[PDB]
């Protein structure tokens, strides 16, 4: 029996820029129990059908992180935006499922939770399944930075602002991507 309970029920989720990966190998799992569960706001399967998930194969990958509700769209085969370009990219030939659920009750705090980070600046886009965790100051213009933070010399990581009374689009959503 697969340790999916460790992935979906972990108290702490990773920041999207430092997205967590957990490989699931010699075990059995009931993929249709998760699909019809009234716990997930999103369960989109690309390349495979969510009905025939049990009647299929290999090892599985479970990537997890937290993003804004209006960024759940970027976790798809051919998307653009700060998260899809600089944080987590799924290939066009992606075979797997993107799972998400509102975690406002868990990851928002009175006055704001700023512990969840995303990459805002980068000289280049990420390749599918690439994890970038470097912290190099970004030279936004012609003035050199010299490793010193200042105007147009920005740290690449920024904090999300998770407040409980935010609208659904600005609320935290826990994401689990299963790759096959």
């Amino acid at each position, epitope marked *: 029996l697969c340790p999916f309970g460790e992935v979906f029920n972990a108290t702490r989720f990773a920041s999207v820029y430092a997205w967590n990966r957990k490989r699931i190998s010699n075990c059995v799992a009931d993929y249709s129990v998760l699909y019809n569960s009234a716990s997930f706001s999103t369960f989109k399967c690309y390349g495979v059908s969510p009905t025939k998930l049990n009647d299929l194969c290999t090892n599985v990958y479970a990537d997890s992180f937290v993003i804004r509700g209006d960024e759940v769209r970027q976790i798809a085969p051919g998307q653009t935006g700060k998260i899809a370009d600089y944080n987590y990219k799924l290939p066009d030939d992606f075979t797997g499922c993107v799972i998400a659920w509102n975690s406002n009750n868990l990851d928002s705090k009175v006055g704001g939770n700023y512990n969840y980070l995303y990459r*805002l*600046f980068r000289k280049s886009n990420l390749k599918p399944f690439e994890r970038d965790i470097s912290t190099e100051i970004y*030279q*936004a*213009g*012609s*003035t*050199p930075c010299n490793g010193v933070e*200042g*105007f*147009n010399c*920005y740290f690449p990581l920024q904090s999300y602002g998770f407040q409980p009374t935010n609208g659904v689009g600005y609320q935290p959503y826990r994401v689990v991507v299963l790759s096959f």
Partner: antibody
Framework: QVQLQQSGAELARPGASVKLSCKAS????????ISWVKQRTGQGLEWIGE????????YYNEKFKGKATLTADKSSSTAYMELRSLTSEDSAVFFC???????????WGQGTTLTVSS | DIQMTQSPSSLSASLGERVSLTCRAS??????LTWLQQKPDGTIKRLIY???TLDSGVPKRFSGSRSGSDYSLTISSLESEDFADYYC?????????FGGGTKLEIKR
């Protein structure tokens, strides 16, 4: 083609505020910083400040703090400079210019002449 | 703050003459220096960036150099179009700062 198109010649009264525009086309607005320069008739060039449109971060020359306010509009790819409590000393040509990745200012707006008079 | 001291403020010269304009930076600017030309109509054009790199569409008579904190703009042989205002600009540190300018006029 990269172009910075500034607002037309402007007349404003003393004590009044003005809002100058600098429309950018021919590249992605958030990629580069937009700066402003003041030049009074027969006088030198003065760096006013710069705005980085991607995050709205700004930096000003101390002499222009309060006097000028730079804002950006990602929707219309237009840069703005609001000039407050206008006096005859603010009558000058105002330019916008692009702070490129390297080489400082590559492109410049045509200029906007401001006249502060009653 | 970085002060760019430009000299001379005014210069009288003849066609075919060799002229040099200097900008002294009050502190280290590591060659992040631009030279601009303003024609009598107000049009600004970049001559040099990075202290010595000639911009495309700028004639070869123009060249930029650096001794220590002295940055020079040299015109090997003056032409009619060259009688104009010149300004240097440092971009090594915020706030960026201009030199006071040089008015190049015709000697007679």
């Amino acid at each position: 083609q990269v172009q910075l198109q500034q607002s037309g010649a402007e007349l404003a009264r003393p004590g009044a505020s003005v809002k100058l525009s600098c429309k950018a086309s021919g590249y992605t607005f958030i990629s580069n910083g937009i700066s402003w320069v003041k030049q009074r008739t027969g006088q030198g060039l003065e760096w006013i400040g710069e705005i980085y449109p991607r995050n709205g971060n700004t930096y000003y020359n101390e002499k222009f703090k309060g006097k000028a306010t730079l804002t950006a509009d990602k929707s219309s790819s237009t840069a703005y400079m609001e000039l407050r409590s206008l006096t005859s000393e603010d009558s000058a040509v105002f330019f916008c210019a692009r702070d490129y990745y390297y080489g400082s200012f590559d492109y410049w707006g045509q200029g906007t002449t401001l006249t502060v008079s009653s | 703050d970085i002060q760019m001291t430009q000299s001379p403020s005014s210069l009288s010269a003849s066609l075919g003459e060799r002229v040099s304009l200097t900008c002294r930076a009050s502190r280290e600017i590591s060659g992040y220096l631009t030279w601009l030309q303003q024609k009598p109509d107000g049009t600004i054009k970049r001559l040099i960036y990075a202290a010595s790199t000639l911009d495309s569409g700028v004639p070869k008579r123009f060249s930029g150099s650096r001794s220590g904190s002295d940055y020079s703009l040299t015109i090997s042989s003056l032409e009619s179009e060259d009688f104009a205002d010149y300004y240097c600009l440092q971009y090594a540190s915020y706030p960026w700062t201009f030199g006071g300018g040089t008015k190049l006029e015709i000697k007679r």
